Amino acid sequence: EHVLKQLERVKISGQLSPRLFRKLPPRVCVSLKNIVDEDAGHIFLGFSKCGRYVLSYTSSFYIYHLYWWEFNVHSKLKLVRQVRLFQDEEIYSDLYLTVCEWPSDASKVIVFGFNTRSANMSDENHRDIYVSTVAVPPPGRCDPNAQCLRHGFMLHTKYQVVPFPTFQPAFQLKKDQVVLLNTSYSLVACAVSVHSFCQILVVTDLRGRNLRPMRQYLTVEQLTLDFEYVINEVIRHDATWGHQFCSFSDYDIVILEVCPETNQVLINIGLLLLAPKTYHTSLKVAWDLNTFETVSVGDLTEVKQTSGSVWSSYRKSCVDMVMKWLVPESSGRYVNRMTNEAVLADSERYTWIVL
Amino acid sequence: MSYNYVVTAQKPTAVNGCVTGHFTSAEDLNLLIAKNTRLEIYVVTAEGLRPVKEVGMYGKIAVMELFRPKGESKDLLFILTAKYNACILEYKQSGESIDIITRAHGNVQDRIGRPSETGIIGIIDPECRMIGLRLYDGLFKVIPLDRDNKELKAFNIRLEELHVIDVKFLYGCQAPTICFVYQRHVKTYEVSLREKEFNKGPWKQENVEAEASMVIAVPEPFGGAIIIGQESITYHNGDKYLAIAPPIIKQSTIVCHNRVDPNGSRYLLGDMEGRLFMLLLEKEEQMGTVTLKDLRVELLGETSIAECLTYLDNGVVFVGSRLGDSQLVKLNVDSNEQGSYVVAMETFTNLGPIVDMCVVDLERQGQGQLVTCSGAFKEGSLRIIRNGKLHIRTVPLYESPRKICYQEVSQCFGVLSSRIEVQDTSGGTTALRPSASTQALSSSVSSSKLFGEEVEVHNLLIIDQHTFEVLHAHQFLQNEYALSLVSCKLGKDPNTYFIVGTAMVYPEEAEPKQGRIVVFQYSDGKLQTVAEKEVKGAVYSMVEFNGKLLASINSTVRLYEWTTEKELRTECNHYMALYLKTKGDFILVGDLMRSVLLLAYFEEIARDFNPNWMSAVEILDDDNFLGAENAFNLFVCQKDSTDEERQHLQEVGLFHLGEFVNVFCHGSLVGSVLFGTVNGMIGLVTSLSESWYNLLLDMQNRLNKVIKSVGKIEHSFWRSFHTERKTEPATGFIDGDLIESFLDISRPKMQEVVANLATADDLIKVVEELTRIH
Amino acid sequence: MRLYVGSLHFNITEDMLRGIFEPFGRIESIQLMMDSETGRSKGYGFITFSDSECAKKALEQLNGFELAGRPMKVGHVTE
Amino acid sequence: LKGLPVYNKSNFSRFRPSVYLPTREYPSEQIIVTEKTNILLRYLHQQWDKKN
C-alpha cells in the first residue's frame, strides 16, 4: 500500500483507524545518543500508554531510583519525577524490574522487582519479590491546601515465595485499582482508594515521598485467599475420589481468567496430594471478590516419572487453556509492560528508540 | 473556561443504509432509510415516495433491519447505534398520533472485546427466533427474541475464528445455522440457545478464494449460500457446489446486493464502479424437489455508486448511495441504445464527502455562499449552497476533487482533480470516462523535467465563478500527486499566485521521497508556471504566512521567502505536519499523533499530549483551539497563560459530534466556524459568554427530562465524549438542535419545562435569535 | 546453560516460557526474539538457565510437545 | 430475464419529510440485559453440571 492513497481513503471514507493503520512503519527514530542526559545509570524501560512520559531506572547496596521523563522532539527530554523505590528495604541483588500500568485507571503505575535467588547462607529455596505502586505525575494541575495537585504517593511491600510461582502481568492487573499477588501460600488482591468500595460487600508501607501517613484521603483494603483452607474445603465437599486422600504436599496456582464486572478470578490449582502414592490433580476454582469461593472443577487423580516436570506439564496445560480461550483485548483496555532484560517502540505514537 | 455552541446548518444527506417492508401498516410498502442518525420512513405510492416521518435517533445508526415475529400483524424494527445502544420499535398510527413506540432498549457494550475490523454485522434469524451481532472479534452477541415479561437476556458465544468477514443466518434449516467467511474459508455453525453455544452445523467447512467478501443466504426453496467477491461467485449447500468466473465481475468489488424475487430466483449486485448486475439462479425439478442448475450474472447499466441497493415495486430500484447522489431508477425490460436496462427517474441530492470548502462571496453583500467539493470517483461535484431554503447548485466534475481555493482577482477557482486511469500496453494509459479534465478548453501537462494497480492523474482545474465551466486543466506528470493548494500574494509582488504542493509517490516504496512546490499565475486565459522548487519529500500542506509560504514536508516545517528574482528561498527547518492554520503570527500545526502544536515567528509555544488522530484543527481565537478527531468527536483546548505550565494546553471542551469532520472553514452563511463532515453535514460553532452557557446548560437539563427520546437513548450518553480509551460527559459545548427543538413543542409543554427561573416567552425570544445564523 | 527454542505461535511471551521452563531448576535469562516493526514475536527465543543439568533434562522433557496450537520443540547443541 | 415482481400495479403509476418530536410517553415493555458471566467460567460451570 501507500500512505497518500491511505490518506485519500481516510478523507472520502471516514474510517481512519490504527487497527488497519498498524502494519505502517514507525516514523521518528533515535539511537538515544542525542537526547540522553549525563553527557548515567539511566536504563530506559519504555514509554507509557499515553506516549508523553518515558520511564527509566538507575540501579547504582543497590538503590533503584525510578524516573518519569517528559518527552520533546526538537527540545529536550526533560526529567519530571524521580522517586525512591522500596525505602527501608535491605536490597542485595541485580533485581530484574518490571513496570506495568492498569488498563484504564492510569493515575498510578505498579512495579515489581524479582531477583534471581534469595539471600536471607543464601537460601536457594526462597525468592524475594518486591512490589510498589507509585502515582503518575498529573500533567494538568489545576503547600498541600489544593486538592487536585497531590497526586503523588507510594506503597511498597516485600515478600518471599517458595517450584516458583509465575509472573502474570495481564490477569493480575486486569481489574482496575486492584493488584493480584500470588504469595505461594496465598493470593492477595490489594485495592487503593483516594478521595465507594471496590472490595467485599500482608502488611504494606504507604508513603507520600518520604513520610509515613495514617491508614483528599487514602485508604487501602486487601482481600486474601488462603490456599490450604480452600483446598481442604474443596476436598471435603467436591471430590469424587477424595476418600483415599490423606494429605497434600505442594501446589502451583495459575490465574486463567479474571472477570472485572463479575469480580471473579479463575485459578487453576495443581495439587500434589497423597492417596498411599504420590498423586497430582488440576483443580479449577472461581473466586468472587464481591463477597467467598465457588467450585468449578474438582478434576481427576493421577500418578506422577519426572520430578518437577509435573509442574511444567501442568503450566503447559494452563497456557493451552488460556491460548484456546482468548478474546483479543482492545487497544486502550490492555496492560502495557515495560522491562529491560539485564529498543523502546511506542507503536501508537510511532516512535523508535534503538539502542 | 471556553464556551461554544454547535448547530446543524445542513442535516446529513448521505445514505447509510436502507430496508424495506410493511412497517406503517400491514399493506403499505414502506421504504426506510438511515442517513447517519436520521431514520426517514417513506410510503411507496402512485405518484411516488410519499415521505411519512423523519424520526431522529440519538446515535449513528449502524444496524437497521425489519423483522416480523409470529403473531405480529406488521413489522417491528431493530436499530443498533454505533455506540451499542439497541432498540426494537413499533409504529402506531391513530389518526394523527404517530407514536413510534419503543418496546426493547438496552446497551450491548461488553467493554472487553475489541472492535472488529470489517464492522458491526447485525443479522436476524429468518424464522424470527433471535438476533446475531458481530460487534467484536472472537465473539458473537446473541439476543433471544422471547416475550416473557421484561428481559431479553442476551449472551455471548465465543466464535473461534477471530477474523470473520461476513456472516448470515441461513434459511430453512430446522435450527438456526449461521454461515460465515473467515480469514479464506467458509464455515457454518448451528446455534443452541438452550445451552447457549455453537454446535457443529451441517455442511462442513470449505475453502474459498481470498478476496471473497459477501455471503448471501438464499431463501426457500434453495437453501445454502452464495459467496461473492473478485470473480468468485460460488453457490454452496452441502453436497452442492457451484462456481462461476465471468470477466465482468473482475474489475471491481461487489459492495451490495438485494433480493428481487421473494423466492431467491434473482438478485441485485452493486459494485464500486457504480455498475448494476442481475445475478440469476436457474431452477430444476428432477422429479417435487427443486435444485439450482447454473449461475449467471447479467449487467444492467450504470448507476451512482451504491452503498445500499433496494428493489421497489414495478421495476424501480432505490440506489442509495453514500458517496454521491441517491437515485430512484427504473429497470427497463427493454434494452437501450448502448445496452442499459436502467433509466434514471429521481436524483436525490446528497453532499456526501465534503472534502473541503471555502466560503466565498460570489455576488456582493457579504452573504456567505459555500462552495464545497464532493463526491468520490465518478460523481465528484462542486456544490454551491446558498441561504434562502438552502439552494444547492451542482456542477458535476465526474472525478475526485481534493481541495479548492478562490482567486478573486480573475474571479476563478483552483481545484484539484484526481482521476483514476487504468493501464495498458496500448500507449501509456487511457482513462475510463469523459470527465471535467477530459473536457477542458485548453489543457497543459507540466513540462518540468526534474499491472494490478491504477494510475492517478492529478490536475489543477481553473473554474469560472459565474458560469462554472472549466477554463484550463493543468495535468501533473507521471506518478505525480498534488496534495495541497493555496492562493495568495507573495513578497512585494503585485499579482496573486496559485501554489500547489505536489509529490512523487511510487509503487515500490511506501514513503515518498521527492516533491515540488509549484507556483502558477493566470494571465486571463493562460495558466503560466512562474516557479518550481524541488524539495526532498512530499509537500503536505502550504499556508500563506505574512507574504511568506509556510510549507510542511514530511516532518520538516519550512518557510519560504518569495525573492525578487521570481524564486523561492528557504529560511529554517523545524522538525507529520499536515494541518497548518495561521492567525496572524501563530501557527497551529496538527500532527496526526502529536495532537496539536503551536509555533511563533520557529519558537515553539505549547503542545498537547493526547491520543487523537486529527481529522482537522481550527484556530478559534488565540486562546482556544478546536479539533475534530477520528473517533467522531470535537474538543477545544485553551492556552493557559510556570514555564511548564506555560508550554501546555488543557482540553476544556469535549463533545461527541457523531461525524468525521474533514474541514473547518471560518465564516458564516448568513464570526463563526463551519465544519463540513463526510456525511454531507455542514455545522456551525459559535463562541459564547459564561452566563449564556450556564443558562442554556440548565435549560437543557430541564429539557432532557421532558422531550422523550426514541429508543430511550440518553442525551447525556449520545453527546458524551467517547473514544476507544475513555468516556466522560460533554463539557464546553451546547447541542444546538436540542435547544432549537424547544420552539417546536406545545405551549403546555413550553410552560411545563421551566417552572424555576421570569416568564417563558423570553426563552421563546432567545432561541428565536439562535436560529438566525443558519 | 544456553538454549534456543523457536516454535512459538506469535502469542507466547517471555513470561510464558519462563513459567514453563522454570520449576526444574534456577533460571537466569529469557530473551524472546520479537520482530521489531510489528511489536510482536518473531517466533524464536534464547533462554539460558543457571546450571547445566536442568537444560539437558529439558531437552528430553519438552521436545516436540504440542504447545496450544503447534508442536513446540526444544533443542540445544551449541546454537 | 425480466418478469419483475409487482406488489401493486398502481404503485409508481402517476409518477419535505416531517420531523418526529416526541412528547407523550407510553412505557417501555422490555429491556435488553446482557448476561454478566464470563464465557470460560460459564462454560466450566455448565460442564460441571453436565458430568456432575
Ligand SMILES: NS(=O)(=O)c1ccc(S(=O)(=O)Nc2cccc3c(Cl)c[nH]c23)cc1
Ligand atoms: N494476550 S493473551 O495471549 O491472551 C495473554 C498474554 C499474556 C498473559 S499473562 O500476562 O497472564 N502471561 C501468561 C500467560 C499464560 C501463561 C503464563 C505463565 Cl506460566 C506465566 N505467564 C503467563 C495472558 C494472556
